[PDB]
Amino acid sequence: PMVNESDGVTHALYPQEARLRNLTYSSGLFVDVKK
Amino acid sequence: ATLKYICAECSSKLSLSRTDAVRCKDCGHRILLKARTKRLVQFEAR
Ligand SMILES: [Zn+2]
């Protein structure tokens, strides 16, 4: 789980933080696309 | 020494102005708490 926020780029999001800062405790999904 | 805000994690007295970055000095943490009045509060021992 991370937080892609402005004023910075990205950092790890912990549950208590998300609870307080009203963010979603979600993680990034990446897929390898072939061509 | 001047008291306006405190950090949650590191708990370092911050004291920042309106639009002076919501982050904490030392740890780059955006979680802040307010002072508490110097206006001494009174209660009934009941
Ligand atoms: Zn701090």
Swiss-Prot record, chain A:
It is found in: Nucleus. Component of the RNA polymerase II (Pol II) complex consisting of 12 subunits. The binding of ribonucleoside triphosphate to the RNA polymerase II transcribing complex probably involves a two-step mechanism. The initial binding seems to occur at the entry (E) site and involves a magnesium ion coordinated by three conserved aspartate residues of the two largest RNA Pol II subunits. Belongs to the RNA polymerase beta chain family. DNA-dependent RNA polymerase catalyzes the transcription of DNA into RNA using the four ribonucleoside triphosphates as substrates. Second largest component of RNA polymerases II which synthesizes mRNA precursors and many functional non-coding RNAs. Proposed to contribute to the polymerase catalytic activity and forms the polymerase active center together with the largest subunit. Pol II is the central component of the basal RNA polymerase II transcription machinery. This is DNA-directed RNA polymerase II subunit RPB2. It comes from Saccharomyces cerevisiae (strain ATCC 204508 / S288c). The chain holds residues 100 to 134 of 1224 of the full protein.
Curated annotation (Swiss-Prot), chain B:
GO terms for biological process: nucleolar large rRNA transcription by RNA polymerase I; ribosome biogenesis; RNA-templated transcription; termination of RNA polymerase I transcription; termination of RNA polymerase III transcription; transcription by RNA polymerase I; transcription by RNA polymerase II; transcription by RNA polymerase III. The N-terminus is blocked. Zn(2+) binds at C7, C10, C24, C27. Component of the RNA polymerase I (Pol I), RNA polymerase II (Pol II) and RNA polymerase III (Pol III) complexes. Component of the RNA polymerase I (Pol I) complex consisting of 14 subunits: RPA135, RPA190, RPC40, RPA14, RPB5, RPO26, RPA43, RPB8, RPA12, RPB10, RPC19, RPC10, RPA49 and RPA34. The complex is composed of a horseshoe-shaped core containing ten subunits (RPA135, RPA190, RPB5, RPO26, RPB8, RPB10, RPC10, RPA12, RPC19 and RPC40) where RPA135 and RPA190 form the DNA-binding cleft. The gene is RPC10. Its main location: nucleus. It comes from Saccharomyces cerevisiae (strain ATCC 204508 / S288c). One of its GO terms (molecular function) is zinc ion binding. The keyword Aminoacyl-tRNA synthetase does not apply. Present with 907 molecules/cell in log phase SD medium. Keywords: DNA-directed RNA polymerase, Metal-binding, Nucleus, Peroxisome, Ribosome biogenesis, Transcription, Zinc, Zinc-finger. It comes from the Eukaryota. A zinc finger (C4-type) spans 7-27. One of its GO terms (cellular component) is nucleus. This is DNA-directed RNA polymerases I, II, and III subunit RPABC4. The chain holds residues 25 to 70 of 70 of the full protein. DNA-dependent RNA polymerases catalyze the transcription of DNA into RNA using the four ribonucleoside triphosphates as substrates. Common component of RNA polymerases I, II and III which synthesize ribosomal RNA precursors, mRNA precursors and many functional non-coding RNAs, and a small RNAs, such as 5S rRNA and tRNAs, respectively. RNA polymerases are composed of mobile elements that move relative to each other. In Pol II, the core element with the central large cleft comprises RPB3, RBP10, RPB11, RPB12 and regions of RPB1 and RPB2 forming the active center. Belongs to the archaeal Rpo12/eukaryotic RPC10 RNA polymerase subunit family. It is found in: Nucleus, Nucleolus; Peroxisome.
